[PDB]
Each structure stands twice: as structure tokens, then as C-alpha cells.
Amino acid sequence: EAQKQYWVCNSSDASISYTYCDKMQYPISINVNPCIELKGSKGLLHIFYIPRRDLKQLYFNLYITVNTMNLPKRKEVICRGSDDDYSFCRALKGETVNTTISFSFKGIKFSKGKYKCVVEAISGSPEEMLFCLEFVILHQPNSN
């Protein structure tokens, strides 16, 4: 069977999809409202996820590619110490995550072509992979 492609949304200037990278684990549902514009936009990210492991200490390595040019790794801590953490950080393996998160994307000026971001999600520390997603963000060809 062919590899499954997942579509998230189209905005006026972008088209967002992803596939599962690395080992296939539990599925995840992602929705963005309104759809992100490469130019910059804000909104709401909805995640529905039954995690493979506890979300505590959750973090992302980000490998971003900009028209075939790879950028140095980025690491983003999501679930830290004490409160102010998202309520999903206290989720344990098998416990439904069904939440909404605010986001503000600053934008890429003079955007064009195609961008990729691989999200390597690690958690449970003891650290194990949680999931790996490879997002492809196409610039709409009929828009600046």
C-alpha cells in the first residue's frame, strides 16, 4: 500500500499537508483555525491525540527545510516545570488529549516555493519517541 498523505488546510497563500515519519505510531488529528498564511497569521490549533506515552517533559526537534535548503536543528520545549504548562502535559499514556492552543505565526516575507518541517516529538523522560510528523507547506502558486 502507498504511503498515506494527510491534508490539514488550504489558506489564501499556503497548502498544508503532512505524512508520518519514522516508525508509525498512534494517529494524531490536527486542525488549524483559520488556516495558516505563510505571510503570518494567528489562530487556534486543535489536537486530538491518544498518546503512546506520558506527555510529561514533551519537546520537539524541528528540522525545517526552505526550498531544499536544510536549516540547523531547532529544539522547542513544550511541557516544562510547574504550572502555566498546558493541561495536556499532565496526560498519561492512553489518556485522550482533546485540546485547543493559541498560536501566532510571524510570517515569512517574500514567501514562495515549498517548505518542510519535520517535528520529532519526544517525551516521557526516560525519553522515547512519541511521534514524528513531516509537514509540507506549499506556497499557493497563484498568490504572493
User: Which residues form the interface with ligand MYR (CB under 6 A)?
Assistant: 8, 16, 30, 32, 36, 45, 47, 49, 76, 78, 88, 97, 101, 103-105, 117, 119, 135
Q: Which is nearer to ligand NAG, 10 or 70 (CB)?
A: 10
Nearest-5° angle of CA 48, CA 97, CA 50?
A: 75
Q: How far is the CB of 23 from ligand NAG (least distance, A)?
A: 25
Residues of this chain that bind ligand NAG (CB under 6 A): 10, 15, 98, 138, 140
26, three cell numbers: 498512534
Q: How far is the CB of 77 from ligand NAG (least distance, A)?
A: 25
Q: Which is nearer to ligand NAG, 122 or 135 (CB)?
A: 135
Q: Which residue has cell 490536527?
A: 30
Closest-CA residue to 93 (of 49, 134, 61) = 49
Nearest-5° angle of CA 16, CA 37, CA 21?
A: 25
65, three cell numbers: 527545510
Q: How far is the CB of 70 from ligand MYR (least distance, A)?
A: 15
